[PDB]
């Protein structure tokens, strides 16, 4: 019976620690995944804006070519 009493309280400790461990790991996964997703969305937005700048440079360069002729 003393052995069973030790096993019960150790089981309660193990489950409480496992709950803390699962909560910490799940949150860290979510915060890291969210950080990557938001940065990816911002990176895609900036890349499109940079492509607009590249298009504008092409347009302005195209005007100089025709002005020479």
């Amino acid at each position: 019976k003393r052995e069973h009493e030790r096993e019960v309280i150790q089981k309660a400790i193990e489950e409480n620690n496992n709950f803390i461990k699962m909560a910490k790991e799940k949150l860290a996964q979510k915060m890291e995944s969210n950080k990557e997703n938001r940065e990816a969305h911002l990176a895609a937005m900036l890349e499109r804006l940079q492509e607009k700048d590249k298009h504008a440079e092409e347009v302005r360069k195209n005007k100089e070519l025709k002005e020479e002729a």
Binding site: K1, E5, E7, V8, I9, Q10, K11, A12, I13, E15
Partner: protein, 424 residues
């Protein structure tokens, strides 16, 4: 010098335990300061059974007060007889048990149990000849139920050859604090089946009914309920506290009352129960003593059979008439006493009456009808356990559902065992 060590655990155990020491201190002439102011040597003849003698002719109760909360024990220390208890015998935690058997038995009470055993060891070392222990507790809460049975198991481990006696308060939906009381009671009953020699089953359902139906109290309180317990506890311990020949010690009481080791749960009864100056005759005491309305277990004696009976009469009365009335009840209702235990009714008489009464009678019955109490708890247990309701309070403390299943089976075996000897 056959000493008894008293332990009270939890809210109910301490509140009932405090009233018990208040009642018997008055009977033995001990004032709240521990000084003797009686007028009869019969009060001090067996005073060492429950009291230690200190410097200055002071009588200190051999009582250990245990709780996982300081609240109730603080009230006891501030109560009428609070100062009479030994200050070092107050062992208490702070977290509490939350009406949870697992907390009292496995997690919260485990942290505190060793310090209680140190006080038990200190009290036992000074005993010339220790009879054993008496415990007051409830089975429906967490501390008295969970930690109380933990204490019993550990005390039996350290003192295997001593008698374990308990006053166990059974839960009831009529007087209920939480829905988990059937869980706590069922878990505790199996501990009592294995690790106690004598258990007085005090049913809060019976105490409420007596206060309501008999004493005409429309709104009974715990104080009213504990008044019945105090009177019952004084009566059942009369043979231990005063000179006598019958059931004078715990072991001899167990030999007379327990024909089979697991069937040691007693139905206590008290008379008179008056809602008051009228003198009560010896025939009236005997009729009320055996009446179901004066039983503290809420079991109908006519639904079962008496294995053994102990009767105690207190006051200046005709012992010849007591014998006639006791033989009259047995001879007029012999169908309710088992025929395979001859002369199973033993009667004792004490000259000193309880406070406020000229005549009193205390009933101690080992009846197979006590199975009704265990059936009632079992039905309430199963109604929730079949849906695993409220189990998370216990699995959160490390317990598994299998332990509940085993406790359920153990009490059903106890019920079946009582039914075996009711038909034999």
């Amino acid at each position: 010098m056959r000493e008894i060590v008293h332990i009270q655990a939890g809210q109910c155990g301490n509140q009932i335990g405090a009233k018990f020491w208040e009642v018997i201190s008055d009977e033995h002439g001990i004032d709240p300061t521990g000084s003797y102011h009686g007028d009869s040597d019969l009060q001090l003849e067996r005073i060492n059974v429950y009291y230690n003698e200190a410097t200055g002719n002071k009588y200190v109760p051999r009582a250990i007060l245990v709780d996982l909360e300081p609240g109730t024990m603080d009230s006891v220390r501030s109560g009428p007889f609070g100062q009479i208890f030994r200050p070092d015998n107050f062992v208490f935690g702070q977290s509490g048990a939350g009406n949870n058997w697992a907390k009292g038995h496995y997690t919260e009470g485990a942290e505190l149990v060793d310090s209680v055993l140190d006080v038990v060891r200190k009290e036992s070392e000074s005993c010339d000849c220790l009879q054993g222990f008496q415990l007051t507790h409830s089975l429906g809460g967490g501390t008295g139920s969970g930690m109380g049975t933990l204490l019993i198991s550990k005390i039996r481990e350290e003192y295997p050859d001593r008698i374990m006696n308990t006053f166990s308060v059974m839960p009831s939906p009529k007087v209920s604090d939480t829905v988990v009381e059937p869980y706590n009671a069922t878990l505790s009953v199996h501990q009592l089946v294995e690790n106690t020699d004598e258990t007085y089953c005090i049913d809060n359902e019976a105490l409420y009914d007596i206060c309501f139906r008999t004493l005409k109290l429309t709104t009974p309180t715990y104080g009213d309920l504990n008044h019945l317990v105090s009177a019952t506890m004084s009566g059942v311990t009369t043979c231990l506290r005063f000179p006598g020949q019958l059931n004078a010690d715990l072991r001899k009481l167990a030999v007379n009352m327990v024909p089979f080791p697991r069937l040691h749960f007693f139905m206590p009864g008290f008379a008179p129960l008056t809602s008051q100056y009228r003198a009560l005759t010896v025939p009236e005491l005997t009729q009320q003593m055996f009446d179901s309305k004066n039983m503290m277990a809420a079991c109908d004696p006519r639904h079962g059979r008496y294995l053994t009976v102990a009767a105690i009469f207190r006051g200046r009365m005709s012992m010849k008439e007591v014998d006639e009335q006791m033989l009259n009840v047995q001879n007029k209702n012999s169908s309710y006493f088992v025929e395979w235990i001859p002369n199973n009714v033993k009667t004792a008489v004490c000259d000193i009456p309880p406070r406020g009464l000229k005549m009193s009678a205390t009933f101690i019955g080992n009846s197979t009808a006590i199975q009704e109490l265990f059936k009632r708890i079992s039905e309430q247990f199963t109604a929730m356990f079949r849906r695993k309701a409220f189990l998370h309070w216990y699995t959160g403390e490390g317990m598994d559902e299998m332990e509940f299943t085993e406790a359920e089976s153990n009490m059903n075996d106890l019920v079946s065992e009582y039914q075996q000897y009711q038909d034999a």
